[PDB]
Design a protein around this ligand. Structure first.
Ligand SMILES: CCCCCCCCCCCCCCCCCC(=O)OC[C@H](COP(=O)([O-])OCC(O)COP(=O)([O-])OC[C@@H](COC(=O)CCCCCCCCCCCCCCCCC)OC(=O)CCCCCCCCCCCCCCCCC)OC(=O)CCCCCCCCCCCCCCCCC
Ligand SMILES: COC1=C(OC)C(=O)C(C/C=C(\C)CC/C=C(\C)CC/C=C(\C)CC/C=C(/C)CC/C=C(\C)CC/C=C(\C)CC/C=C(\C)CC/C=C(/C)CCC=C(C)C)=C(C)C1=O
Ligand SMILES: CCCCCCCCCCCCCCCCCC(=O)OC[C@H](COP(=O)([O-])OCC[N+](C)(C)C)OC(=O)CCCCCCCCCCCCCCCCC
Ligand SMILES: CCCCCCCCCCCCCCCCCC(=O)OC[C@H](COP(=O)([O-])OCC[N+](C)(C)C)OC(=O)CCCCCCCCCCCCCCCCC
Ligand SMILES: CCCCCCCCCCCCCCCCCC(=O)OC[C@H](COP(=O)(O)OCCN)OC(=O)CCCCCCCCCCCCCCCCC
Ligand SMILES: CCCCCCCCCCCCCCCCCC(=O)OC[C@H](COP(=O)(O)OCCN)OC(=O)CCCCCCCCCCCCCCCCC
Ligand SMILES: CCCCCCCCCCCCCCCCCC(=O)OC[C@H](COP(=O)(O)OCCN)OC(=O)CCCCCCCCCCCCCCCCC
Ligand code: SF4
Ligand code: SF4
Lengths: 381, 96, 67, 91, 310, 79, 56, 157, 178
């Protein structure tokens, strides 16, 4: 019984393994090393002051995570974000899937041993964070996507700069494309490893690129269109066989398909307000709170007490880059939530490691964790 | 062709004062590059800008020799830059 | 720019030619300006030794027709 | 001697380093791994029976030389062939 | 004078060892869009000297027979620096009639260091990872040796000095290129460099400070030596008896470029699987090598080209 | 034949491997030079050639190395 | 950029792509800082009439 | 200059320079601060330039950067890895999660700071402490390592 | 709309030419050489790194960075202790206790931001009515001791005085947006 765990794996995984020789016969992953109490702390915090927590569950896809809480709270308040805000959330949501996939594809290679793909793309990633920082002020952990609408309008130069990044980004995917997609060494390390059959993937609740890689056609972005994913056109990259290669190839395609969605969002973003105009849900503007009494009262109450969302419960799932990220928010009439079960695409995927890594070497397990794109913040919550 | 690059190289080397100057820059700033002094703050830091270079490296600061008493010949830290000139260096404002 | 990698390579190179030039001139100094005889097989060692006996004690000294 | 001189400097240089290094600061089992090691020597021995080939090239016979050498290489390779055919070499 | 020569071969090589490390940290850098180490010293020239001291200064190791632990790095540095004793850069230092057998035998002994490392680790799996390495070293030894035997039979002797006379008209790459590639890949395995590198993979880590350094120095010196053997056996530098140094000048150029190549290989390729590595040698290369070995006993005879002994 | 084809495209090492095995097992048999190897190496004079007494009953043996009698390596020359 | 043509040609070839057209380093193409002041639009509900909240 | 004091000041200056120039760090990799350093290792702010090793095993690591929350289940480990690092060793606490509990301070599963578990040398502040900010913190460690005068203390001890 | 990645549309039957092309791909490692070309190409590209002390990575006006308390131009500290900056802080970082100053004005006797507790959300910047507490640009405030990170009113007011000129410029640039 070798207790693997800095473990070469992503995050901290004490993967209690049983080495039948170098071949590993059983894995018993011991997560819990990053359980922070995220869901017991949220019960003691108002709906706005719990948003930040959602940027730290999966820490590589911040805004898409905070689009699941924002959609939930918005449902429970029967309020909808203004048209410009919904496009901005879709614009930032695809910048995050490019950001997560650059994370997942390059760090997987770092584990296998290819070191250069990480450096080339990570420079392209700081180019992207800059977009977060220029719109929210935080490179990552922005807090930009608010429960109702988004917080502040895009600065007047961001969409031009997002065009220049998107214009040249595809060559950058093309470049690691050449360096790590046909190398016999990659294919051998990735092809026919961790094959998961279609029905087994649905039964284990995989719900992600892991679901799509084996050929099941499910994208919450087209099936159940949240925000504006009904007005943007993209092709889900369904893979055929399920080996860790087909899953890589799917992740590289989604980066390409996201550039197609980002293009549409820059081309068609509407003039308008970025946050719903109900002062009861979204704070009043700085000038208004300093000149109108109804606005100061609404600013004081919203910041000090809260939205006080109507009693109810909802499970809202959005296609986070890892997979289906859902928040089951149970709400009493109070301004602070009662329960917030964060479904993490990752709690299900890590469970599959024992089944997927069957008849596999110590080295294959490093690839198996890499192809689940598991970030332990989401699993541990 | 190649002669041109060598030429601009000479310009750079010969640019930062005499050899003394080049060594001052070569060893503490680790970069022999010549720009346009955009100003000198009262602490002593000298700021330069070369718009030809990429966004990341078009604006640089060559810190002082002594700040607030402490010798800053080798022990240069970022905070040495004054708050007024901090945003110019970080590109927060495009105005010196 | 890549040219900065050159300084390091140069130092490596200079330090890989020294050995080849050094070994090949500390031989032509110790052996009297004549390449150190390579005695692969005994015959050669014999001839070499014979040379020693022929003059001084060192084989590199080489007597000629004028002897 | 010349070699002895070089080698002792070689050990001295390494022992010097380790000494300063310690002075300046002031059961798993398997059959496949085992099987290969065997294969390795069976091949290592063959390397031996093949090493004199540079001197044997100059042998006056020539025909017998090659006839012999070709037989050795072929029979070992068949050994390999059966290693492949059997689970051996399939880890 | 002999000592002077001893110093001229070891000291320069060791210094070259050091700067290879720097060069590995800049060529990998520029390939990955980063300057690499330039801030310590000028252009990073003082960088190799800097960390070495760190290691040494780092306080003593705390492991558990205290000999199979200290013998292992000493052996690794001793064999690697020793194998430079016969290299025939122009004139060799100690010309050995059976020179290539010396290089093959000395390389093979590096395995014992690996073996003892584990028996001293006292860690069961460490032993595993050690036996898990004996196959990369000994298995990449079986094709490594046969590839040389093919060469020798076209050189006529085991002495590395003969190849300077064999390659006076053409490199042995033109002929025998198929093996060069297979010598290059085997040289990549035997120096545990990237495409074939589990030594730090699946984490060597057992040694810190001075022991770490010695093995490490050894690896890098080897990295050069094996590349240098490629630059004598297959890429034959032009030799002029009147001026020997153009031999060493070109030996310098070819060795640096092929040393640059394994640096370039590392950044460019993901690491192979343990069995994928042995699958290559025993399935892909050994049948190619054994057959091409026979072709090199036949090419001489029926082309009436049997090489001149001596 | 068909497998041969795929074999040429899949597992294309063994194919080459065997091919060489054979080509080395054939060229020697059929070649205009194979015979020379046993001669060229035979001729190379390594051990002193001891001279035989002249009973005077031998015309074949050359009485002097440069004589027009005896073995010749002009075959080696202009080879 | 700022690369001697030959290096560029080697670059483009070794990569197999016109990397010059789409350089990663940014040069005077990025939005200038201090972009003009923004007068953002006020959304609905700001009407001064027929804006009863009970109806929204 | 000539004085046993001057020789002992110059030689530590040498010993301090070696440790300062080559700080092989070891990143545990907790939470998200590890990403904000994977950005330091990346091309915009290379760390290697400064003499920093992207990946170093504990036994060969000079600096441990604790990025991310130290839960009460990873604490017993951090201490082990800190305890198994070679003697000359330094700790940099990155993130309000590690230097202090940060969001998650009052959690039942989070240690309120790594200072409780491992002695900490430089505390780098910020929820995702920016990557320059870590680079400033690593440079501040280098300023702390320059000031240390171990040989001087042994001489006048 | 879906897209098959790694799905072979059909079974191209091997043609010698095809077989050779493939066999050559395995035998002479053709694709491996392709990968080496890509890395050699970048070796020739300009590196993207910045001299960190001399050059700084660009941060635009909204960067949250380090907390500071501003003062009116006259010299009267802006905070009037409404204490909703304390109410909306997600981490419980800000602790405020107040009493009527001798002037009779409302002011905070103690304002303590625990920066190790703070997760730099920037809501305090948002919440303040007088905008007394602002997210200042500086990100370089790494400290040797944990206590230094805890900040009382005097450090923040001093932080405010030091960076007021840039804070004013930053708020000037972004207030229309807010
Ligand atoms: C070695 C022979 C020279 C190699 C050389 O000149 O390369 C640059 C030169 C231009 O390359 P580049 O990528 O266009 O350079 C970027 C800028 O154009 C040119 O860069 P720039 O705009 O910064 O130009 C100024 C630069 C100009 O510097 C140079 O271009 C010459 C560099 C010589 C290095 C030796 O000088 C400097 O910035 C200071 C550094 C000078 C060299 C530092 C390293 C010296 C090492 C000495 C020991 C080795 O290379 C070529 O002309 C083609 C080389 C093809 C090789 C295959
Ligand atoms: C254990 O895992 C690890 C590795 O794999 C073993 C690494 O390679 C790495 C990555 C990088 C390195 C180890 C670089 C190490 C570099 C060196 C040891 C340089 C050593 C240089 C010398 C000893 C020079 C000696 C010079 C002289 C004798 C001069 C005499 C006058 C690390 C950090 C690591 O932890
Ligand atoms: C031979 C092995 C190495 C011996 C020392 C080699 C030279 C060390 C050196 O030049 O230090 C430069 C270093 C340069 O680094 P630094 O410590 O001045 O700080 C670097 C500042 N920036 C970031 C701008 C580069 O200066 C010193 O270390 C001063 C003390 C040197 C003492 C050497 C004699 C004892
Ligand atoms: C000047 C620096 C030149 C660097 C060249 C390599 C990097 C650039 C590669 C550009 C590229 O993408 O094309 C690759 C190309 C890309 O081709 P491809 O893989 O896309 O497909 C073409 C081949 N078919 C169609 C048949 C599959 O690869 C090749 O053309 C084949 C390379 C064969 C290499 C065989 C091993 C190396 C040679 C061993 C023998 C010794 C040669 C000399 C060694 C040194 C002697 C001093
Ligand atoms: C550390 C362990 C490994 C040590 C390094 C590896 C050394 C390998 C030596 C292999 C044999 C070398 C050899 O055969 O050369 C013999 C040399 C010349 O002989 P020759 O080639 O025939 O030429 C004659 C006409 N010129 O002339 C000679 O006769 C040399 C005689 C042997 C020289 C050996 C030099 C010392 C090596 C042993 C050191 C022992 C101490 C360390 C023990 C380690 C134990 C693990
Ligand atoms: C001297 C050394 C010679 C080689 C020694 C070692 C030979 C070992 C051969 C084993 C063949 C059987 C085998 O096990 O491999 C089948 C191969 C798949 O191999 P693999 O996937 O690696 O798995 C191995 C275990 N099955 O799948 C195969 O079917 C491979 C088929 C290989 C043979 C294809 C045809 C080769 C001959 C082509 C001749 C072309 C014309 C040549 C003309 C020559 C003229 C002289
Ligand atoms: C007469 C006919 C002669 C025919 C000669 C054919 C070429 C000779 C060399 C063939 C080597 C054997 C081979 O075909 O490749 C083995 C392996 C690829 O095998 P793979 O495609 O995975 O197939 C597995 C099937 N079971 O190859 C590898 O994967 C090698 C592993 C990668 C290591 C790095 C590869 C790139 C190296 C680039 C530089 C190469 C420089 C070579 C020359 C250096 C100077 C001498
Ligand atoms: S500090 Fe902020 S960023 Fe670093 S881990 Fe804790 S939460 Fe994630
Ligand atoms: S909100 Fe602004 S003003 Fe009211 S207390 Fe907090 S800081 Fe002082």
């Amino acid at each position: 019984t070798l207790n693997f765990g800095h473990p070469a794996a992503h995050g901290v995984l004490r993967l209690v393994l049983e080495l039948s020789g170098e071949m590993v016969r059983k894995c018993d992953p011991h997560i819990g090393l990053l359980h922070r109490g995220t869901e017991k702390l949220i019960e003691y915090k108002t709906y706005l002051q719990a948003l930040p927590y959602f940027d730290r569950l999966d820490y590589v896809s911040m805004m898409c995570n905070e689009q699941a809480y924002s959609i939930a709270v918005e449902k429970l308040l029967n309020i909808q974000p203004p048209p410009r805000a919904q496009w901005i959330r879709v614009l930032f949501g695809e910048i995050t899937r490019i950001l997560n996939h650059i994370m997942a594809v390059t760090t997987h290679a770092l584990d296998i041993g290819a070191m250069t793909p990480f450096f080339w793309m990570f420079e392209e990633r700081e180019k992207m964070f800059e977009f977060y920082e220029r719109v929210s002020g935080a490179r990552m952990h922005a807090a930009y996507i608010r429960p109702g609408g988004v917080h502040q309008d895009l600065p007047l130069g961001l969409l031009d700069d997002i065009y220049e990044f998107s214009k040249n980004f595809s060559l950058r995917i093309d470049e690691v494309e050449e360096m790590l997609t046909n190398n016999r060494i990659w294919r051998n390390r990735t092809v026919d490893i961790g094959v998961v059959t279609a029905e087994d993937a649905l039964n284990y609740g995989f719900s992600g690129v892991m679901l799509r890689g084996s050929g099941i056609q499910w994208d919450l972005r087209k099936t159940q269109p949240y925000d504006v994913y009904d007005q943007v056109e993209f092709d889900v990259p369904i893979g055929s066989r399920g080996d860790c290669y087909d899953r890589y190839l799917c992740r590289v395609e989604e980066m390409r398909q996201s550039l197609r969605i980002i293009e549409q969002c820059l081309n068609k973003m509407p003039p308008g307000e970025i946050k719903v105009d109900d002062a009861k849900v979204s704070p009043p503007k700085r000038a208004e709170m300093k000149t109108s009494m109804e606005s100061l009262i609404h600013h004081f109450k919203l910041y000090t007490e809260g939205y006080q969302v109507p009693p109810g419960a909802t499970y809202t799932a959005i296609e986070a880059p890892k997979g289906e990220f859902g928040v089951y928010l149970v709400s009493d009439g109070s301004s602070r939530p009662y329960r917030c079960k964060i479904k993490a695409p990752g709690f299900a995927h890590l469970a599959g490691l024992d089944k997927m890594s069957k008849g596999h070497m110590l080295a294959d397990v490093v690839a198996i964790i890499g192809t689940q794109d598991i970030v332990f913040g989401e699993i541990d919550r | 062709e190649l002669v041109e690059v060598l030429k601009r190289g000479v310009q750079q080397v010969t640019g930062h004062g005499g050899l003394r100057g080049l060594l001052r820059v070569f060893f503490r700033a680790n970069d022999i590059r010549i720009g346009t002094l955009v100003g000198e703050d009262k602490y002593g830091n000298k700021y330069y800008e070369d718009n030809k270079q990429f966004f990341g490296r078009h604006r640089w600061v060559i810190y002082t020799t002594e700040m607030n008493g402490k010798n800053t010949f080798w022990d240069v830290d970022g905070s040495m830059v004054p708050p007024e000139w901090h945003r110019w260096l970080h590109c927060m404002t495009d105005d010196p | 720019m890549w040219f900065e990698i050159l300084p390091g390579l140069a130092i490596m190179g200079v330090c890989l030619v020294i050995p080849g030039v050094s070994t090949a001139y500390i031989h032509k100094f110790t052996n009297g300006g004549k390449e150190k005889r390579v005695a692969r097989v005994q015959y050669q060692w014999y001839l070499m030794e014979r040379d020693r006996r022929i003059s001084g004690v060192n084989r590199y000294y080489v007597s000629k027709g004028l002897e | 001697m010349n070699l002895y001189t070089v080698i002792f400097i070689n050990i001295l240089l390494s022992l010097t380093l380790i000494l300063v290094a310690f002075w300046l600061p002031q059961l798993p089992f398997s059959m496949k791994f085992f099987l290969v090691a065997i294969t390795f020597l069976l091949f290592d021995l063959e390397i031996a029976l093949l090493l004199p080939l540079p001197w044997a090239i100059q042998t006056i016979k020539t025909s017998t030389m090659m006839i012999m050498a070709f037989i050795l290489v072929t029979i070992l390779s068949l050994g390999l062939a059966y290693e492949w055919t059997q689970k051996g070499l399939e880890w | 004078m002999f000592f002077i020569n001893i110093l001229t071969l070891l000291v320069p090589i060791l210094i070259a060892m050091a700067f290879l490390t720097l060069v590995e940290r800049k060529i990998l850098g520029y390939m990955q869009l980063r300057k690499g180490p330039n801030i310590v010293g000028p252009y990073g020239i003082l960088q190799p000297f800097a960390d070495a001291m760190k290691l040494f200064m780092k306080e003593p190791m705390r492991p558990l027979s205290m000999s199979l632990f200290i013998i292992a790095p000493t052996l690794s540095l001793t064999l690697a620096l020793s194998l430079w004793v016969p290299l025939p850069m122009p004139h060799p230092l100690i010309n050995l009639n059976l020179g290539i057998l010396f290089i093959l035998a000395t390389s093979s002994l590096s395995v014992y260091s690996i073996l003892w490392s584990g028996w001293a680790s006292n860690s069961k799996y460490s032993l595993f990872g050690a036996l898990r390495a004996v196959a990369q070293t000994i298995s990449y030894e079986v094709t490594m040796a046969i590839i040389l035997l093919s060469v020798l039979l076209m050189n006529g002797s085991y002495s590395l000095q003969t190849l300077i006379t064999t390659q006076e008209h053409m490199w042995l790459l033109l002929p025998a290129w198929p093996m060069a590639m297979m010598w290059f890949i085997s040289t990549l395995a035997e120096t545990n460099r990237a495409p074939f590198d589990l030594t730090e993979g699946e984490s060597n880590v057992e040694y810190a400070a001075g022991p770490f350094a010695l093995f490490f120095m050894a690896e890098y010196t080897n990295i050069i030596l094996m590349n240098a053997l490629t630059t004598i056996i297959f890429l034959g530098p032009l030799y002029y008896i009147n001026l020997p140094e153009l031999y060493s000048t070109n030996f310098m150029m070819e060795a640096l470029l092929l040393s640059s190549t394994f640096l370039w290989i590392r950044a460019s390729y993901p690491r192979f699987r343990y069995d994928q590595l042995m699958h290559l040698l025993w399935k892909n290369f050994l049948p190619l090598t054994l057959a091409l070995c026979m072709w090199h006993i036949s090419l001489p005879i029926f082309t009436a080209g049997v090489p001149p002994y001596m | 034949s068909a497998f041969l084809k795929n074999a040429w495209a899949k597992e294309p090492v063994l194919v080459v491997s065997f091919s060489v095995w054979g080509l080395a097992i054939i060229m020697p048999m059929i070649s205009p030079y194979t015979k020379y190897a046993s001669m060229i190496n035979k001729a190379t004079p390594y051990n002193y050639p001891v001279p035989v007494r002249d009973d005077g009953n031998m015309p074949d043996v050359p009485s002097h190395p440069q004589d027009p009698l005896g073995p010749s390596l002009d075959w080696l020359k202009n080879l | 950029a700022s690369a001697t043509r030959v290096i560029q040609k080697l670059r483009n070839w070794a990569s197999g792509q016109d990397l010059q057209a789409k350089l990663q380093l940014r040069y005077q193409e990025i939005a200038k800082r201090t972009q003009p002041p923004p007068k953002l639009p006020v959304g609905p509900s700001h009407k001064l009439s027929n804006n009863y909240y009970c109806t929204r | 200059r000539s004085r046993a004091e001057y020789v002992v000041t110059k030689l530590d200056d040498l010993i301090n320079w070696a440790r300062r120039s080559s700080l092989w760090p070891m990143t545990f990799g907790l939470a998200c601060c590890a990403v904000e350093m994977m950005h330091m290792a990346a091309p915009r702010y290379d760390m290697d330039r400064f003499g920093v090793v992207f990946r170093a095993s504990p036994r060969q690591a000079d600096v441990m950067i604790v990025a991310g929350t130290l839960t009460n289940k990873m604490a017993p480990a951090l201490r082990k890895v800190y305890d198994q690092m070679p003697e000359p060793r330094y700790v940099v606490s990155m993130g309000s999660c590690a230097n202090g509990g940060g969001y998650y301070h009052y959690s039942y599963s989070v240690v309120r700071g790594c200072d409780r578990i491992v002695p900490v040398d430089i505390y780098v502040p910020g929820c995702p402490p920016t990557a320059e900010a870590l680079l400033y913190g690593i440079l501040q460690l280098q300023r702390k390592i320059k000031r240390e005068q171990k040989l001087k203390i042994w001489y006048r001890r | 709309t879906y897209k098959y990645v790694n799905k072979k549309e059909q079974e191209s039957e091997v043609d010698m030419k095809s077989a050779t092309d493939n066999a050559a791909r395995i035998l002479m490692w053709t694709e491996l050489i392709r990968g080496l070309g890509m890395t050699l190409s970048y070796l020739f590209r300009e590196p993207a790194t910045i001299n960190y002390p001399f050059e700084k990575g660009p941060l635009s006006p909204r960067f949250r960075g380090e907390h500071a308390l501003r003062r009116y131009p006259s010299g009267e500290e802006r905070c009037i202790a409404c204490k909703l900056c304390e109410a909306i802080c997600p981490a419980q970082a800000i602790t405020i206790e107040a009493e009527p100053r001798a002037d009779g004005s409302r002011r905070t006797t103690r304002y303590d931001i625990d920066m190790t507790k703070c997760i730099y959300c920037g809501f305090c910047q948002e919440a303040c009515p007088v905008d007394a507490i602002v997210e200042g640009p500086n990100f370089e405030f790494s400290t040797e001791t944990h206590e230094e990170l805890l900040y009382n009113k005097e450090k923040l007011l001093n932080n405010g005085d030091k960076w007021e000129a840039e804070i004013a410029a930053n708020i000037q640039a972004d207030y229309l947006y807010r």
